[PDB]
């Protein structure tokens, strides 16, 4: 028989030094692409970052104005 | 894996006030939520007429980047036309944006997640949930 | 060819030609065959108009034959974004435009399509939009 | 995109792959022979026939019900 | 072991009755999508239909007008 | 499997006159030909200013439907910028549309098929062929 | 987000800000961060301007840092189609517009982008196009 | 899109799949910790730094050479 030689599949990673490393409880992580940035959250806590920050002005959608 | 469609009222309710009970409902159902592009139209309109459009568009981007936005296609317009006729035979008034959102969910077999269920109550053939 | 589209028909011109079948629009249809489209917003209004009519069975058949010769574009995220900007651009000026017509205008401005409408006076309040009256 | 011709039932048939497939609206096409070439188009979609075809009832959309 | 039952893969075909059937020499065929229509040509004769018809007006591109 | 890029001059040459020698060159190399979107711009312009735009756009559609149309991307603009500088150091004048078409082919490693090879003669790093 | 883009910068405004770095454009850049783009046609002119300069090594580095903060859109079939229509619309009126500016205008009209330009008087001859002067 | 964290060399590393991958321009990102969440952004792309950064030579594009 006759087969082929190939290289294993790689992927683009980011490194986290110990000063910004994630705790030991998180072995799975959710990643979200917001524009040019990306957000690294624990598996079942994907919305905590958007809830604790990201405030809108007080006038936003005070009137839906649906005809 | 798509299961829920969020209406416009629940999005305004969540973005303005950021409730704790909604945060746990979102974290558990992550990856199964979406909105119609009609709702995206209303959200973008609210930011563009506000006093801080760029800041408010940034908050919408983070919200949208975590869910899917469905296009209002021919099937969605078809169910919306039927619902509008079904509602006309009664004395049930429903808003034009809410009519299109309801027909969009019915065309995809999705559950409407809303802020007050009594306005989607009169449409036949779709299920609603109250996440307030 | 998806890059052959040039005109988008609003709801007003569609009702006008389906009800009356005028010769002037008949000519411009033959001239610009294969380059016309409508938004799914317009398709929604047409389907609703047949379902609530006295003869929905035969009116739906006429509409489906009308749609069979043009393309129907989905109301996507870009169309929704331009409609949001347009609704704020009009609120700053106190110019009233109907909600379905607002979505039709934003859908065409998102892809540079020329609006074919019966009432050009309502769409001319929108910035960066070309219109033509084929009546 | 190159395909292959076969035979199904009593007649000839051309194999249309996915990239150049027809929409589900079309189940009836008109075929015209030009030399060694065959041109297929969906059937019955001429504007001159539709403008003279079946007409719409007198009550259809007498009131467009756009709110505002 | 445990496997699955499935249906074989189909595809959308057009029929050619004998009055418009293709000659016997063509066993492979090229298909081209032009708008709403499709063009069925022999394998190595894909351009013959476009050359023998499809004429442009005499004024087309008499001046390229490149600055 | 893409190998040749057709310039604007060879397209005008082929569409207007329909030569027999070009027909056999097209049938043999079917599936390996393409044009830059710059050339598509010039063809569409010629039809829109002519006396029968719809008829001429129909002939262009059948021509385009048999080949690929490549987008003028960042790499194509990069090679075009280098070529324009390489040509400036000499006294070699080249048209702006032809400059962009040449840099587009060089960015993709394609062979320029043209009507008269002497205008693409002075650009370094690309091969040309005369299909007249 | 690809649906967050709103403005397209022509070549004139790019040269103006790279050479002078004015404070007025600096303010409007900070305000509309992440919503600006240029056409690959403009990128071609910039790269050519550095390669033929007295210091191409350091001018290319400045331009690449400028491009790193905006998006570059490909000149696709839709942009080519709108440029063809525009060149015929202008020939009917005897209004002269440069070839690179013609392609920039067609690229923005194909996707409903607002043109940010230093010379608004040249782009205002194009039908269905919005312009803004950030100088 | 859920991924997995591993270890490479002496430090921790997060696995970025294809759908949310970064362009090849980016080889250096700034990471900020917000609670249990880490936010990554490309490095050195602030307009206030570029407007005060390296400047362009005096001859650059003194003549835009657009024909016509």
Automatic annotation (TrEMBL), chains C, G:
Its cofactor is Mg(2+). InterPro entries: PIN-like_dom_sf (IPR029060), PIN_dom (IPR002716), Type_II_TA_system_RNase (IPR050556), VapC_family (IPR022907). NCBIfam families: PRK13725.1. The keyword Hydrolase applies. Residues 8-128 form the PIN domain. This is tRNA(fMet)-specific endonuclease VapC. SUPFAM superfamilies: PIN domain-like. Toxic component of a toxin-antitoxin (TA) system. A site-specific tRNA-(fMet) endonuclease, it cleaves both charged and uncharged tRNA-(fMet) between positions 38 and 39 at the anticodon stem-loop boundary. Its toxic effects are neutralized by expression of cognate antitoxin VapB. Keywords: Endonuclease, Hydrolase, Magnesium, Metal-binding, Nuclease, Plasmid, Toxin, Toxin-antitoxin system. GO terms for molecular function: endonuclease activity; hydrolase activity; magnesium ion binding; RNA nuclease activity; toxin activity. Its EC number is 3.1.-.-. It comes from the Bacteria. Belongs to the PINc/VapC protein family. Mg(2+) binds at residues 10, 101. It holds the Pfam family PIN. It is an enzyme of class 3 (hydrolase). It comes from Shigella sonnei.
């Amino acid at each position: 028989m006759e087969t082929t030689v190939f290289l294993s599949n790689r992927s683009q990673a980011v490194r986290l030094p110990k000063a910004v490393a994630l705790p030991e409880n998180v072995k799975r992580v959710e990643v979200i692409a917001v524009g040019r940035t990306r957000i690294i959250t624990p598996a079942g806590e994907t919305w905590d970052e958007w809830f604790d920050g990201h405030s809108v002005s007080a006038d936003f959608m005070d009137n839906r104005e649906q005809p | 894996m798509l299961k829920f469609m969020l209406d416009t009222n629940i999005c305004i309710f969540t973005i303005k006030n950021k409730p704790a009970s909604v945060r746990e409902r979102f974290n558990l159902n992550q990856g199964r939520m979406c909105i119609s592009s009609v709702t995206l139209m209303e959200l973008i309109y609210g930011a563009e007429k506000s006093q801080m459009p760029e800041r408010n568009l940034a908050v919408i981007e983070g919200f949208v980047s975590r869910i899917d936005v469905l296009d209002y296609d021919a099937a969605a317009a078809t169910h919306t036309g039927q619902i509008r006729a079904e509602l006309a035979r009664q004395g049930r008034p429903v808003g034009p944006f809410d009519q299109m959102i309801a027909g969009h969910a019915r065309s995809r077999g999705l559950i409407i997640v809303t802020n007050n269920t009594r306005e989607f109550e009169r449409v036949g053939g779709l299920r609603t949930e109250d996440w307030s």
